[PDB]
Design a protein around this ligand. Structure first.
Ligand SMILES: C[C@@H]1CN(c2cnc(Nc3cc(F)c(OCC4CC4)c(F)c3)nc2NC2CCOCC2)CCN1
Length: 268
């Protein structure tokens, strides 16, 4: 039953606090922190992990949400390893995630433009990044899960260079979501088009010269993100279809993923 499936997912998500060692701080956000950590597995060995730290209803909602996320099983979707609820002198929820040396896609794109960072990213690799995101998003929409925060900063790079969607913002929000507050998988498609633009520009902030407060009016007048300098016309057409005014006219992730794979296969 619906209850039975939720009770199953809930049983698997919690990790004992003593099976975890918190290390150095990797980042400090507005309402949380990311720390490197060690997780002791059921086979006796320890695994390198990343721990993201963050009222009974809010904790129960967090546990329910985390249990849903741990159930995601796709190579282009981040696999949540589990959660820990620590107690202060106030509950402190902790989410256990894979340790990924290459970090977030946004930082990786910016680093590639500097001599000491990773090498210049060729077109085939940038398109492969978009294919992976489309693959993860296709999986999420098919299981009717809304991302709500799709951007290059929330996409992670695995050790084999596979991109995976994670952390399920005005310049990434669809024209109808800014006004009516309504959100569909077609709003995620809009955010995907912006993410494709971030990848093509190698990490530029969307809409240069356009302030965040004037975004709704800019879009309402038909203006959209401009085509990047060495971007293929076919690739720009794919990302432009993501920003169609009517959400119904926007393609699904499944249509977008195949359009992207075909364009990638056509590259020498
Ligand atoms: C040695 C260092 C280790 N570091 C690193 C290694 N492993 C993870 N794992 C990880 C961390 C997360 F916070 C995750 O949540 C989703 C986030 C995108 C929002 C996640 F799915 C995996 N994160 C790392 N850094 C992040 C710190 C916070 O800002 C983003 C980069 C890469 C840079 N080099």
């Amino acid at each position: 039953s619906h209850m039975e499936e939720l009770q199953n997912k809930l049983e698997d998500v919690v990790i004992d606090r003593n099976l975890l060692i918190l290390g150095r701080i990797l980042g400090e956000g507005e309402f949380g922190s990311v720390m490197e950590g060690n997780l002791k597995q059921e086979d006796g060995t320890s695994l390198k992990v990343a721990v993201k730290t963050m009222s009974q209803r809010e904790i129960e909602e967090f546990l329910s949400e985390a249990a849903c996320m741990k159930d995601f099983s796709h190579p282009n979707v981040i696999r949540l390893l589990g959660v820990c609820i620590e107690m202060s002198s106030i509950p402190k929820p902790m989410v256990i995630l894979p340790f990924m040396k290459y970090g977030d896609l946004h930082t990786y794109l910016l680093y590639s433009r500097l001599e000491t960072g990773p090498r210049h990213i060729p077109l085939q690799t940038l398109l492969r990044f978009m294919v992976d995101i489309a693959l993860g998003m296709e999986y999420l929409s098919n299981r009717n899960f809304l991302h709500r925060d799709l951007a290059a900063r929330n996409c992670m790079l695995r050790d084999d260079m596979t991109v995976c969607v994670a952390d399920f913002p005005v310049k990434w929000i669809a024209i109808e979501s800014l006004a009516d507050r309504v959100y569909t998988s077609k709003s995620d498609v809009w955010a995907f088009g912006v993410t494709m633009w971030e990848i093509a520009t190698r990490g530029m902030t969307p809409y240069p010269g356009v302030q965040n407060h004037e975004m709704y009016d800019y879009l309402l007048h038909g203006h959209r993100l401009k085509q990047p300098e060495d971007c293929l016309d076919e690739l720009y057409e794919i990302m432009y279809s993501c920003w169609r005014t009517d959400p119904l006219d926007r393609p699904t992730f499944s249509v977008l993923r195949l359009q992207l794979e075909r364009l990638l296969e056509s590259l020498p």
